[PDB]
Amino acid sequence: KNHPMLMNLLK
Amino acid sequence: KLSEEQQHIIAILLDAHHKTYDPTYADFRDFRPPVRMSPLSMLPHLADLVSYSIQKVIGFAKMIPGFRDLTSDDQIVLLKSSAIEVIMLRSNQSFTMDDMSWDCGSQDYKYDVTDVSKAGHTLELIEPLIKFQVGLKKLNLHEEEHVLLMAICIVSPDRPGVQDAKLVEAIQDRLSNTLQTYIRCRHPPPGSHQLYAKMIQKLADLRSLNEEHSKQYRSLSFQPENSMKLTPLVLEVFGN
Ligand SMILES: C=C1/C(=C\C=C2/CCC[C@]3(C)[C@@H]([C@H](C)[C@@H](CCCC)C[C@@H](O)C(C)C)CC[C@@H]23)C[C@@H](O)C[C@@H]1O
């Protein structure tokens, strides 16, 4: 469960 | 009546939406071109449209009053589960009951049931989606109600994987109360008749659409050949 892109966009 | 805080919330949500939803749809030109004739000829274009829209929904979410007080992990879970739902809600803005389609400024960017079926989905899901759009359109929501609904959909305490569900609920309640009060003060009858109950019902409708979407997404992205047509963001958010 890793969401690097989603995390980067949420700031 | 609307407290000053509640008027604040609406002001913020209206602005957040204006900054994340371009009604001229100028960026659609950057998407892989749509092909209308290859039962997946519209997948590249629509996948890009969805990926782009996921980014916009995130940008909207970040501006929701109180969203910031949430942890990184809870923010991810809320966005991952609500994305397709907010995209369905926000799409109502371009949906038109004239010919049951999404009119994004030009014939090339005007999508109908045929186009969506060419993205790898069946009527099992498309027909209900259209029915959803028509029922939502008929509510003639004020832009204020539209943005509050999307915010309420995003900050849902019952999404699986949520940790601080009570904080999520507190945040949501503040939006709900703003909405309920706004309807009572700014929305004139008969249009306001059970409007809040009807809006919450659309959220329930979205859960069914989300569920069927997750099943068809699995099927569509089953063959590496098709998941290959999506985008990295779409794969990360919707799974796989
Ligand atoms: C985006 C926006 C818009 C429309 C959304 C539509 C209409 C065409 C078909 C879309 C883009 C659907 C997709 C074809 C998804 C199908 C949903 C189930 C029928 C496909 C995804 O599972 C994945 C394969 C990319 C989802 C929402 C639908 C237009 C505009 O309102 C901006 C908004 O952000």
| First CA to last CA distance, chain A | 18
Annotation: binding site of B: 21, 53, 90, 94, 121, 213
The answer to whether the peptide bond before residue B190 is cis (omega within 30 degrees of 0) is yes
- Integer-rounded Cα Rg, in Å, for chain A is 6
PDB experimental method: X-ray
When divided into structural domains, chain B yields a total of: 1
Is residue B162 in contact with ligand 1, taking CB distance under 6 Å? no
Is B237 in contact with A3 (Cβ distance < 8 A)? yes
Resolution in A: 2.0
**In this structure, what CATH number is given to the domain that contains residue B233?**
1.10.565.10
Nearest atom, ligand 1, residue B56 CA: 34
DSSP labels, B51-66? HHHHHHHHHHHHTSTT
B106: containing domain = 1-240
Beta bridge partners, B101, equal B96
